[PDB]
Design a protein around this motif. Structure first.
Motif, PDB file in Angstrom:
ATOM      1  N   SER A  55      46.505  30.608  41.965  1.00  9.06           N
ATOM      2  CA  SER A  55      45.143  30.227  41.604  1.00  9.06           C
ATOM      3  C   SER A  55      44.106  31.275  42.060  1.00  9.06           C
ATOM      4  O   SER A  55      43.017  31.326  41.487  1.00  9.06           O
ATOM      5  CB  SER A  55      44.809  28.818  42.085  1.00  9.06           C
ATOM      6  OG  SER A  55      45.278  27.832  41.175  1.00  9.06           O
ATOM      7  N   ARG A  56      44.464  32.132  43.046  1.00  9.68           N
ATOM      8  CA  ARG A  56      43.606  33.228  43.492  1.00  9.68           C
ATOM      9  C   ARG A  56      43.742  34.329  42.428  1.00  9.68           C
ATOM     10  O   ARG A  56      42.755  34.964  42.045  1.00  9.68           O
ATOM     11  CB  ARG A  56      44.057  33.782  44.859  1.00  9.68           C
ATOM     12  CG  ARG A  56      44.089  32.758  45.993  1.00  9.68           C
ATOM     13  CD  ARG A  56      43.901  33.394  47.364  1.00  9.68           C
ATOM     14  NE  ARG A  56      45.141  33.953  47.908  1.00  9.68           N
ATOM     15  CZ  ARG A  56      45.390  35.253  48.047  1.00  9.68           C
ATOM     16  NH1 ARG A  56      44.487  36.154  47.676  1.00  9.68           N
ATOM     17  NH2 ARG A  56      46.544  35.662  48.557  1.00  9.68           N
ATOM     18  N   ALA A  57      44.982  34.518  41.928  1.00  8.90           N
ATOM     19  CA  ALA A  57      45.324  35.506  40.924  1.00  8.90           C
ATOM     20  C   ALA A  57      44.680  35.171  39.581  1.00  8.90           C
ATOM     21  O   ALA A  57      44.329  36.078  38.834  1.00  8.90           O
ATOM     22  CB  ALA A  57      46.839  35.592  40.787  1.00  8.90           C
ATOM     23  N   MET A  58      44.553  33.866  39.274  1.00 12.03           N
ATOM     24  CA  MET A  58      43.971  33.338  38.043  1.00 12.03           C
ATOM     25  C   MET A  58      42.438  33.569  38.057  1.00 12.03           C
ATOM     26  O   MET A  58      41.832  33.755  37.013  1.00 12.03           O
ATOM     27  CB  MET A  58      44.289  31.834  37.916  1.00 12.03           C
ATOM     28  CG  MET A  58      45.693  31.537  37.434  1.00 12.03           C
ATOM     29  SD  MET A  58      45.996  31.894  35.695  1.00 12.03           S
ATOM     30  CE  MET A  58      45.090  30.564  34.923  1.00 12.03           C
ATOM     31  N   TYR A  59      41.836  33.544  39.244  1.00 12.18           N
ATOM     32  CA  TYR A  59      40.428  33.810  39.450  1.00 12.18           C
ATOM     33  C   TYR A  59      40.161  35.307  39.157  1.00 12.18           C
ATOM     34  O   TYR A  59      39.271  35.598  38.350  1.00 12.18           O
ATOM     35  CB  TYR A  59      40.029  33.453  40.898  1.00 12.18           C
ATOM     36  CG  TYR A  59      38.726  34.070  41.359  1.00 12.18           C
ATOM     37  CD1 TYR A  59      37.550  33.899  40.626  1.00 12.18           C
ATOM     38  CD2 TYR A  59      38.650  34.778  42.557  1.00 12.18           C
ATOM     39  CE1 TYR A  59      36.346  34.453  41.047  1.00 12.18           C
ATOM     40  CE2 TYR A  59      37.442  35.328  42.997  1.00 12.18           C
ATOM     41  CZ  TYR A  59      36.295  35.174  42.227  1.00 12.18           C
ATOM     42  OH  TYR A  59      35.104  35.736  42.602  1.00 12.18           O
ATOM     43  N   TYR A 173      50.595  39.755  43.693  1.00 12.56           N
ATOM     44  CA  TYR A 173      50.132  38.842  44.757  1.00 12.56           C
ATOM     45  C   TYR A 173      49.746  39.547  46.053  1.00 12.56           C
ATOM     46  O   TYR A 173      48.752  39.179  46.683  1.00 12.56           O
ATOM     47  CB  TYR A 173      51.151  37.730  45.032  1.00 12.56           C
ATOM     48  CG  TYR A 173      51.320  36.679  43.950  1.00 12.56           C
ATOM     49  CD1 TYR A 173      50.559  36.714  42.783  1.00 12.56           C
ATOM     50  CD2 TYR A 173      52.203  35.619  44.117  1.00 12.56           C
ATOM     51  CE1 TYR A 173      50.692  35.731  41.802  1.00 12.56           C
ATOM     52  CE2 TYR A 173      52.338  34.625  43.148  1.00 12.56           C
ATOM     53  CZ  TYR A 173      51.594  34.693  41.986  1.00 12.56           C
ATOM     54  OH  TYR A 173      51.768  33.720  41.029  1.00 12.56           O
ATOM     55  N   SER A 174      50.518  40.570  46.430  1.00 14.89           N
ATOM     56  CA  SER A 174      50.296  41.379  47.628  1.00 14.89           C
ATOM     57  C   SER A 174      49.030  42.261  47.518  1.00 14.89           C
ATOM     58  O   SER A 174      48.471  42.659  48.539  1.00 14.89           O
ATOM     59  CB  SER A 174      51.527  42.240  47.907  1.00 14.89           C
ATOM     60  OG  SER A 174      51.843  43.040  46.778  1.00 14.89           O
ATOM     61  N   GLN A 175      48.590  42.563  46.281  1.00 19.13           N
ATOM     62  CA  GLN A 175      47.393  43.353  45.980  1.00 19.13           C
ATOM     63  C   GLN A 175      46.107  42.470  45.905  1.00 19.13           C
ATOM     64  O   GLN A 175      45.022  42.996  45.621  1.00 19.13           O
ATOM     65  CB  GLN A 175      47.607  44.141  44.672  1.00 19.13           C
ATOM     66  N   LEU A 176      46.232  41.141  46.157  1.00 13.17           N
ATOM     67  CA  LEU A 176      45.116  40.187  46.141  1.00 13.17           C
ATOM     68  C   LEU A 176      44.743  39.768  47.565  1.00 13.17           C
ATOM     69  O   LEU A 176      45.336  38.814  48.073  1.00 13.17           O
ATOM     70  CB  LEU A 176      45.433  38.917  45.317  1.00 13.17           C
ATOM     71  CG  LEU A 176      45.888  39.062  43.868  1.00 13.17           C
ATOM     72  CD1 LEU A 176      46.702  37.878  43.468  1.00 13.17           C
ATOM     73  CD2 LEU A 176      44.712  39.246  42.923  1.00 13.17           C
ATOM     74  N   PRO A 177      43.747  40.412  48.224  1.00 16.46           N
ATOM     75  CA  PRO A 177      43.378  39.978  49.586  1.00 16.46           C
ATOM     76  C   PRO A 177      42.878  38.536  49.639  1.00 16.46           C
ATOM     77  O   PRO A 177      42.215  38.069  48.706  1.00 16.46           O
ATOM     78  CB  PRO A 177      42.281  40.971  50.003  1.00 16.46           C
ATOM     79  CG  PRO A 177      42.440  42.136  49.083  1.00 16.46           C
ATOM     80  CD  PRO A 177      42.913  41.551  47.784  1.00 16.46           C
ATOM     81  N   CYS A 546      31.963  35.544  46.124  1.00 10.07           N
ATOM     82  CA  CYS A 546      32.847  36.104  45.086  1.00 10.07           C
ATOM     83  C   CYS A 546      34.130  36.682  45.668  1.00 10.07           C
ATOM     84  O   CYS A 546      35.086  36.930  44.934  1.00 10.07           O
ATOM     85  CB  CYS A 546      32.122  37.104  44.186  1.00 10.07           C
ATOM     86  SG  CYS A 546      31.527  38.573  45.047  1.00 10.07           S
ATOM     87  N   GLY A 547      34.134  36.878  46.982  1.00  9.75           N
ATOM     88  CA  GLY A 547      35.279  37.408  47.702  1.00  9.75           C
ATOM     89  C   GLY A 547      35.358  38.918  47.636  1.00  9.75           C
ATOM     90  O   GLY A 547      34.327  39.614  47.671  1.00  9.75           O
ATOM     91  N   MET A 548      36.589  39.425  47.550  1.00 11.84           N
ATOM     92  CA  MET A 548      36.916  40.856  47.516  1.00 11.84           C
ATOM     93  C   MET A 548      36.136  41.678  46.463  1.00 11.84           C
ATOM     94  O   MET A 548      35.858  42.851  46.695  1.00 11.84           O
ATOM     95  CB  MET A 548      38.439  41.005  47.328  1.00 11.84           C
ATOM     96  CG  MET A 548      38.999  42.394  47.642  1.00 11.84           C
ATOM     97  SD  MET A 548      38.431  43.267  49.138  1.00 11.84           S
ATOM     98  CE  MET A 548      38.534  41.883  50.457  1.00 11.84           C
ATOM     99  N   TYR A 549      35.773  41.055  45.325  1.00 17.56           N
ATOM    100  CA  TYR A 549      35.047  41.686  44.231  1.00 17.56           C
ATOM    101  C   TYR A 549      33.672  42.288  44.634  1.00 17.56           C
ATOM    102  O   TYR A 549      33.225  43.216  43.962  1.00 17.56           O
ATOM    103  CB  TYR A 549      34.913  40.758  43.013  1.00 17.56           C
ATOM    104  CG  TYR A 549      34.752  41.570  41.751  1.00 17.56           C
ATOM    105  CD1 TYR A 549      35.595  42.653  41.479  1.00 17.56           C
ATOM    106  CD2 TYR A 549      33.713  41.310  40.856  1.00 17.56           C
ATOM    107  CE1 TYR A 549      35.428  43.433  40.334  1.00 17.56           C
ATOM    108  CE2 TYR A 549      33.532  42.095  39.713  1.00 17.56           C
ATOM    109  CZ  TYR A 549      34.364  43.181  39.483  1.00 17.56           C
ATOM    110  OH  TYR A 549      34.153  43.998  38.400  1.00 17.56           O
TER     111      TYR A 549
END
Ligand SMILES: CC(=O)N1CCN(c2cccc(-c3cc(-c4ccnn4C4CCOCC4)c4c(N)ncnn34)c2)CC1
Length: 887
Positions: A55-59, A173-177, A546-549
Motif C-alpha cells: 500500500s506504500r508502493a501503491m501510493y 519494496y527495498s527502494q521505498l523508504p 507526502c513523505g519521501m517525495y
C-alpha cells in the motif's frame, strides 16, 4: 526540535517561503487551518500504512489505468482475435544480460497471469515479481486487465509492441523508504431572531493618494441580494464618512455565503479607484460585528462596473494600499448562523404551510407550488430546461416555474444547477427548503457536479453536495485530468478549511501522481499575493505528510530555480550577444559546482515517471525563439532506456504565460478522448506543458517533427505531399495519408471550435509518419472581438488528402475528410456542457482571454447551441465554405 527545524527548512525550500512566516500570522482562521488540516494528513498516512509495503508502493507508483476496463470496438479490431503480443524482459546474472520472452496472451490478462506465462516460456527454454514499463518508472502493481493500463491501451491503439520488465517485488519494496510522519509543534450566541434591516457604517479611508464616494453591495456570488448603496461625495483630501448605509434586506434573510462588495469611486464620469470584498460571516458561522479595516485591491484592466463581486474576498496583504475602515452592527450578544436542525424544522414548517394553501392563496404567487396539478406539459418543459447548456439564460418565468416544481425536479437530478439559480437566495424561507432538497438530492455525474464548484454557486451546502459527488464517483484518472479546474475553484471557497480542500489534499497525499501535479499547480501561483497564503498553507500541510517525495520535489524545485537564474542572466546580461557567445556562457555556467549537481539526477516535473540522469551539455541548445528557450537533454538512467528513449529531452521556457496553452492542450486531449470512444480515430498531439511559476514552464519535446515551413523550404503546393510520399515509400504511403487527413480533421474542428490563434507554416508541425499537429495555443476564444477559421486548409494540405490530385476540392478522399469533420464537430456539440464548465471553472484564474461568461459565449456560437443539430452542421459548413473561398 532538531528534526522539526530540518523538516521546516525543507518545506520552506519547497514552497519558496519560510514556515516561520505562517507562525507570525495572527488570524485565528490561518492558525486553525494549520492545526485542523492535520487530520487529513493523519488519515492519508494511516491508508498508506494499511497493507505495508504494497500500500506504500501503491501510493508511490499508482496504476496508470483508464477509467473503464471495457475496450472500444475499433480498438479491439487492432488485436489478433482479442489477443495481444507483449514482450517480457528478464535481467539475468549481474552482467545485466537482457533476455526477452514474446507472449501472445488475452488483452484482459491480469499482471499475475502475464508473469506466470513469462516464467513458463523461461522454464520451457530448458508472485514474488511485479511488471515494470521498460525505460520508465511505471509499475503494474494492481489486478487490472492488462488492456486497462494506459501504456498497453496506447500500444494497442498505436500498433506498437509493449515492452515490460519482470522485477522482484523486494527490489522495488527495498527502494521505498518508510516515512513516519510527525505531528508538528503547532498541532498542540444568537440566530435568525435578529428582527432588523441591514446597516453597515463606512467610517473613513487611509492611503488614498490620488470628490470621492464608497459604493457598496450585498452579494451572493456574483448576484445582488438587494440594491447597491453609495456614500456621500466627500473630497479625496479628506476621505471621511462616519455614515451608516441601509440595505433593502432583513438580517435573518442573509444567506450563509453573503458578502459585502465595495469600492472607492471618483465622480457623470464614474470610475472605480480601489475595490475589496468581505464575507458577512466568518469561518466559525459568526456574523461579523464592530470595527474592521480592509486594505483594497487595484482595479483590474478592463473593469467597467463600479464593483468587483467576482473578485477575491479578503484584505490586500500589501498594507501600503487604500485602507477602508468600517463598522458592522452590534446586537445583544454574538450572532451565529442557525444549525441544520433549526433550518430543517423551518423548511418542514414552510413545506407543511404551503401544502395547506387554497387555490386562491397559490394564485397570489407564481413561485407557489400547486400539489397534484403537475401535467405532462409541465414535466416535458422541465426536461427541456434541464437539457440546456449552463450559459443558457433562464428567464424569470422559468425561474418561478422551476422553483414551484422543485419537488418534481428531484426526479430529474441533472436539473439541480438550473433550480439552484432559480432560488431567491435573499429569502430564508426558500433557502431553508433548498437545503433540505440538497441534503437528499440524488447524486449526479462528477462532470455535472464540477459546475457546482464554480463562481455561480457560493453556498457551502451546494458545494458540499458537489464534493460528495466527487468523493463517490470521481476516479483517480478523471481527478488527474481535471486537477487544474479543481485547484482553481479553491480560490472560490469563502474559507481556508472547506470540504473541497480536504478532498483534494487527501487524494494528493494518497496518490503520488496526483500529489505531484497538485504540488506544481499550487507552487506555480505562489507569486500571486491574492492566493499565496491560501496555497502556501495548503502546500505546508501537503509537504508535512507526502513523505519521501518532499526530498524528490526539492531536487525538482532546485533544478528549476537554477534554470530560472540562468535564463534570467541570458535575457538581462547576454540578450544582444551571438548564439555562439550565449552558448559558451551557458555551458561554462552549467559546468560550475553551484549548478552541475542541481541540474542532473532528478525526476521530470512534466512526468515524474521519467528520470533525468546526467545532463548532456553537447546536446543542449538555445532555441532561435524570442524568449531564448532551452532545449535540454539528459540521459535516461533506466536499465532498459534503449526500449523507450536513451535520452530524455525537455524544453524550458522563461518568459511566456503558459496557462492558456495548458488549458487548450487539456481540452485537445478531452476532445480526442471523446472522438476515440465515439469510434472515430482522429489522432491528436496534446504535448506536455507545465507552468512551474510566473511565465515559466516546461514543454514536452516531440521527436521527428518538422514545421510546414521547414518542409516547403528544403514554391509548389505539391512539396508537402512529395515530402510525405518520400518519407513513407511503398505500402506505408497510405497509412501516412490516412494519419495526415485524420489528424488534420481533428485540428480543423478543435481549432474552429476553440478560436485558437491564426495558423501559419511555423505554427503547424508534421511528423515523419504523417501526423499533423499544432503548437502555440496562447490565444483562444473571442480574442479578436464574426467567428473565425484559424486553420485554413491550403492547397498543400488538400493535395496530401487527395493523394496528389489536381482537383482536390472535388475527390472521394476530400468527401471522406469532410465526413470526419462533421462527425467530429457533432460529437463535441453533444459534450458542450463539459467544455463550457471546464472554461467556467477557470474564470477566476487571471487568464487575459478568459475574464467573463461572454468570452465563454464564443463556444456557444462555434457549437451553434441555440440551433438544431442539422442547422449547426449547416452553420459549420458555411464557416468552412466562406474561409476556404471554395467548398
Ligand atoms: C535538434 C535541435 O536542437 N533542434 C532542431 C529542432 N528545432 C525546432 C525547430 C522548429 C520547431 C521546434 C519545436 C517547437 C516546439 C513547440 C511546441 C510548443 N511550443 N514549442 C516551442 C517551445 C519553445 O518556444 C518556441 C515554441 C517543439 C516541440 N514541442 N518539440 C519539438 N520541436 N519543437 C524545434 C530546434 C533545434
Amino acid at each position: 526540535n532538531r528534526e522539526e527545524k530540518i523538516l521546516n527548512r525543507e518545506i520552506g525550500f519547497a514552497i519558496g517561503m519560510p514556515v516561520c512566516e505562517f507562525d507570525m500570522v495572527k488570524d485565528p482562521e490561518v492558525q486553525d487551518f494549520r492545526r485542523n488540516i492535520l487530520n487529513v494528513c493523519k488519515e492519508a498516512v494511516d491508508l498508506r500504512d494499511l497493507n505495508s509495503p504494497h500500500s506504500r508502493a501503491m501510493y508511490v507508483y499508482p496504476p496508470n489505468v483508464e477509467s473503464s476496463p471495457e475496450l472500444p470496438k475499433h480498438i479491439y479490431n487492432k488485436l489478433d482475435k482479442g489477443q495481444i503480443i507483449v514482450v517480457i524482459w528478464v535481467i539475468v546474472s549481474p552482467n545485466n544480460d537482457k533476455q526477452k520472452y514474446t507472449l501472445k496472451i488475452n488483452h484482459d490478462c491480469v499482471p499475475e497471469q502475464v508473469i506466470a506465462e513469462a516464467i513458463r516460456k523461461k522454464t520451457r527454454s530448458m508472485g514474488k515479481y511485479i511488471l515494470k514499463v521498460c525505460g520508465c518508472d511505471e509499475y503494474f502493481l494492481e489486478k487490472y486487465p492488462l488492456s486497462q493500463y494506459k501504456y498497453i491501451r496506447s500500444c494497442i491503439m498505436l500498433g506498437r509492441m509493449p515492452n515490460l520488465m519482470l522485477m522482484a517485488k523486494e527490489s522495488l519494496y527495498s527502494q521505498l523508504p518508510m516515512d513516519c510522519f510527525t505531528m508538528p509543534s503547532y498541532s498542540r450566541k444568537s440566530l435568525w431572531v435578529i428582527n432588523s434591516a441591514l446597516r453597515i457604517k463606512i467610517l473613513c479611508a487611509t492611503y488614498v493618494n490620488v470628490k470621492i464616494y464608497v459604493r457598496t453591495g450585498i452579494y451572493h456570488g456574483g448576484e445582488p441580494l438587494c440594491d447597491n448603496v453609495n456614500t456621500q461625495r466627500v473630497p479625496c483630501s479628506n476621505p471621511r464618512w462616519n455614515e451608516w448605509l441601509n440595505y433593502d434586506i432583513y438580517i435573518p434573510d442573509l444567506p450563509r455565503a453573503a458578502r459585502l462588495c465595495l469600492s472607492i469611486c471618483s465622480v457623470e464620469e464614474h470610475c472605480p479607484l480601489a475595490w475589496g470584498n468581505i464575507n458577512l460571516f466568518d469561518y466559525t458561522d459568526t456574523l461579523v460585528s464592530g470595527k474592521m479595516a480592509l486594505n483594497l485591491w487595484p482595479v483590474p484592466h478592463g473593469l467597467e462596473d463600479l464593483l468587483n463581486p467576482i473578485g477575491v474576498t479578503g484584505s490586500n496583504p500589501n498594507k501600503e494600499t487604500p485602507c477602508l475602515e468600517l463598522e458592522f452592527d452590534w446586537f445583544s450578544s454574538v450572532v451565529k448562523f442557525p444549525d441544520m436542525s433549526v433550518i430543517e424544522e423551518h423548511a418542514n414548517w414552510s413545506v407543511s404551510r404551503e401544502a395547506g394553501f387554497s387555490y386562491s392563496h397559490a394564485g397570489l404567487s407564481n413561485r407557489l407550488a400547486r400539489d397534484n396539478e403537475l401535467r405532462e406539459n409541465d414535466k416535458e418543459q422541465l426536461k427541456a430546461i434541464s437539457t440546456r447548456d449552463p450559459l443558457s439564460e433562464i428567464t424569470e418565468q422559468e425561474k418561478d416555474f422551476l422553483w414551484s416544481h422543485r419537488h418534481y425536479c428531484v426526479t430529474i437530478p441533472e436539473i439541480l444547477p438550473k433550480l439552484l439559480l432559480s432560488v431567491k437566495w435573499n429569502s430564508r424561507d426558500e433557502v431553508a427548503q433548498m437545503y433540505c432538497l440538497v441534503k437528499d438530492w440524488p447524486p449526479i455525474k462528477p462532470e455535472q457536479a464540477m459546475e457546482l464548484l464554480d463562481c455561480n454557486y457560493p453556498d457551502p451546502m451546494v458545494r458540499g453536495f458537489a464534493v460528495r459527488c466527487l468523493e463517490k464517483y470521481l476516479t483517480d484518472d478523471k481527478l488527474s485530468q481535471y486537477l487544474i479546474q479543481l485547484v482553481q475553484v479553491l480560490k472560490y471557497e469563502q474559507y481556508l478549511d472547506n470540504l473541497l480542500v480536504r478532498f483534494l489534499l487527501k487524494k494528493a497525499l494518497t496518490n503520488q501522481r496526483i500529489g505531484h501535479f497538485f504540488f506544481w499547480h499550487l507552487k506555480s501561483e505562489m507569486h500571486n499575493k491574492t492566493v499565496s497564503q491560501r496555497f502556501g498553507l495548503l502546500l505546508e500541510s501537503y509537504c508535512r505528510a507526502c513523505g519521501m517525495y518532499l526530498k524528490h520535489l526539492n531536487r525538482q524545485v532546485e533544478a528549476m530555480e537554477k534554470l530560472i537564474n540562468l535564463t534570467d542572466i541570458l535575457k538581462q546580461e547576454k540578450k544582444d550577444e551571438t548564439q555562439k557567445v550565449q552558448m559558451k556562457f551557458l555551458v561554462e555556467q552549467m559546468r560550475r559546482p553551484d549548478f552541475m549537481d542541481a541540474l542532473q539526477g532528478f525526476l521530470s516535473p512534466l512526468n515524474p515517471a521519467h528520470q533525468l540522469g546526467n545532463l548532456r551539455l553537447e546536446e543542449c541548445r538555445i532555441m532561435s525563439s524570442a524568449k531564448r528557450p532551452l532545449w535540454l537533454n539528459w540521459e535516461n538512467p533506466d536499465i532498459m532506456s534503449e526500449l523507450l528513449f536513451q535520452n530524455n529531452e525537455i524544453i524550458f521556457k522563461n518568459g511566456d504565460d503558459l496557462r492558456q496553452d495548458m488549458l487548450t492542450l487539456q481540452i485537445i486531449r478531452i476532445m480526442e478522448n471523446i472522438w476515440q470512444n465515439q469510434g472515430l480515430d482522429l489522432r491528436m498531439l496534446p504535448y506536455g506543458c507545465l507552468s512551474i511559476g510566473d511565465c515559466v514552464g516546461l514543454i514536452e519535446v516531440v521527436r521527428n517533427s518538422h514545421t510546414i515551413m521547414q518542409i516547403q523550404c528544403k514554391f509548389n503546393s505539391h512539396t508537402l505531399h512529395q515530402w510525405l510520399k518520400d518519407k513513407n515509400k511503398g505500402e506505408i504511403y497510405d497509412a501516412a495519408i490516412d494519419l495526415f487527413t485524420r489528424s488534420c480533421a481533428g485540428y480543423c474542428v478543435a481549432t474552429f471550435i476553440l478560436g485558437i490563434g491564426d495558423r501559419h507554416n511555423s505554427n503547424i508541425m508534421v511528423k515523419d509518419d504523417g501526423q499533423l499537429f499544432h503548437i502555440d495555443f496562447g490565444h483562444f476564444l473571442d480574442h479578436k472581438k464574426r467567428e473565425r477559421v484559424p486553420f485554413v486548409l491550403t492547397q498543400d494540405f488538400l493535395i496530401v488528402i487527395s493523394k496528389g490530385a489536381q482537383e482536390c476540392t472535388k475527390t472521394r478522399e476530400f468527401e471522406r475528410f469532410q465526413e470526419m469533420c462533421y462527425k467530429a464537430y457533432l460529437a463535441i456539440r453533444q459534450h458542450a456542457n463539459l467544455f463550457i464548465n471546464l472554461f467556467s471553472m477557470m474564470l477566476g484564474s487571471g487568464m487575459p482571454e478568459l475574464q467573463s461568461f461572454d468570452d465563454i459565449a464564443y463556444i456557444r456560437k462555434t457549437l451553434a447551441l441555440d440551433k438544431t443539430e442539422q442547422e449547426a452542421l449547416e452553420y459549420f459548413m458555411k464557416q468552412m465554405n466562406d474561409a476556404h473561398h471554395g467548398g
